[PDB]
Design a protein around this ligand. Structure first.
Ligand SMILES: Cc1cc2nc3c(=O)[nH]c(=O)nc-3n(C[C@H](O)[C@H](O)[C@H](O)COP(=O)(O)O)c2cc1C
Ligand SMILES: Cc1cc2nc3c(=O)[nH]c(=O)nc-3n(C[C@H](O)[C@H](O)[C@H](O)COP(=O)(O)O)c2cc1C
Ligand SMILES: [Cl-]
Ligand SMILES: [Cl-]
Lengths: 197, 196
């Protein structure tokens, strides 16, 4: 039941220290690949960060966050969220695997966009969310947990340089066997978010 | 869910068969259970049933004509207008179409700072997770669906029709399927994955 995984899925921030096999990662990515996308453009690209390169990753992250703390960053209206970003770095350090998700069709966050450009971003970004959600749900099916991460935006330039990518950085997802079982997070009810016409 | 992820197709032919309200609620409930950045839950849903179908279709056709008349918002995408017209015909066949809004969204006509972009990107991913949950739940229930951004060819017209100041993200049409498409092409793992 996908309904079962949809209901049971949680953001997991404590993991078992146990390695995840390449094959398990393969299965999760191949669920992402099966997402729908605008014009079947499939704009998602993935960079799997293993133990090999984790420390270097985390250093780039931390440099970006420090740059933000120093007021040389990109999110001056979100200083209250820097503490959360530092917590996410810790979670990424402990998680056995983190996968970066890129948008090969993405334009820089630093550039100003026409309405048409915005619509392409919106379409592609939604599509990538479908992929990452597929990955998340597949992790649940496999007995893993995951955490979807946009705190990487506090080190946007630094991580794009680290990745040496010409693509737009969208997110990371950390994965592993879970070491917590959170109850359902708060949600607005269907009456709060739906208008029937 | 692995079954539904695999089996899911974009469906563009529908039976003439209504959907119960509780079925629609189950689909929306799946959406609500998506993750979202800061648990902001930016999605809002407007469910369009047969009573308002014609009015919907008229607003979207208006926008499409405005694009054809070079008075639209996607002048670089004229080659895609024919597809948008086909989407209108598909929305006509579906018993239900749900519009998905981003209550936190800025107009496509406004210019965004890097920080505003990041917030949009995070919200848009979140809404994609919701709409994918809806799509997968439709499959599980024996329904089909079509995720729609061709609505952008009538962005202003549809926001006016919906009487909303929120950002229009997408529509999803829902119904009992009258086709069973073969898998659509996909890139392979090697094409999209780098290992570090
Ligand atoms: C964000 C998004 C927007 C889409 N917009 C439309 C649309 O307006 N009309 C349409 O016929 N299909 C639309 N699609 C469906 C895609 O064409 C379809 O997902 C892609 O061709 C892959 O086919 P599949 O979904 O059957 O695997 C959209 C899909 C997504 C994810
Ligand atoms: C696009 C997106 C970005 C997110 N970014 C982070 C993040 O950087 N760090 C974190 O701890 N959680 C992050 N989350 C997880 C959310 O906080 C979580 O989905 C929300 O609190 C609801 O909890 P649940 O997923 O357990 O239902 C993100 C989720 C999404 C969808
Ligand atoms: Cl499409
Ligand atoms: Cl968050």
């Amino acid at each position: 039941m996908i309904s079962d995984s949809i209901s049971k899925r949680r953001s997991i921030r404590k993991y078992k220290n146990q390695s995840i096999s390449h094959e398990t990662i393969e299965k999760i990515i191949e669920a992402g690949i099966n997402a729908p996308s605008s014009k079947n453009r499939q704009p998602w690209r993935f960079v799997v960060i293993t133990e090999k390169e984790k420390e270097s990753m985390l250093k780039a992250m931390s440099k970006g966050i420090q740059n933000e703390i120093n007021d040389n960053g990109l999110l001056p209206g979100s200083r209250q969220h820097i503490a959360g970003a530092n917590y996410t770095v810790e979670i990424m350090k402990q998680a056995p695997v983190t996968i970066f998700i890129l948008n090969i069709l993405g334009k820089s966050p630093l550039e100003k966009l026409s309405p048409e450009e915005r619509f392409y971003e919106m379409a592609n970004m939604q599509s990538i969310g479908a992929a990452i959600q597929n990955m998340s749900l597949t992790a649940v099916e496999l007995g893993l947990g995951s955490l979807w991460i946009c705190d990487v935006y506090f080190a946007y330039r630094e991580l794009c340089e680290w990745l040496n990518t010409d693509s737009q950085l969208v997110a990371a997802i950390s994965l592993g066997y879970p070491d917590e079982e959170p109850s359902r997070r708060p949600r607005l009810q269907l009456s709060d978010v739906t208008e029937w016409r």
